[PDB]
Amino acid sequence: AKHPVPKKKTSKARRDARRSHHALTPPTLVPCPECKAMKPPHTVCPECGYYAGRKVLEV
């Protein structure tokens, strides 16, 4: 191996187009079955998680 190196400083155009996929996705949220707050699905809520099983108690 020798030492590949970039031959040309890349244009602001070009890096910024590289980044055209970099944008985030907002987290997918659903309203809590009991409590008022929003929760990502299929997760025991940070307040009073579930019914049949014993949730982590915020209650």
| Closest separation in Å from C-beta 57 to another protein | 20
Q: Is 22 in the site for RNA (CB under 7 A)?
A: no
The DSSP 8-state label assigned to residue 2 in this structure reads -
Place of tokens 């915020």: 58
Q: Is 1 in the site for another protein (CB under 8 A)?
A: no
Q: Is 38 in the site for another protein (CB under 8 A)?
A: yes
Q: Is 12 in the site for RNA (CB under 7 A)?
A: yes
Please, are residues 45 and 35 in contact by the beta-carbon 8 Å criterion? Answer: yes
Residues near RNA, by CB under 7 A? 9, 12, 16
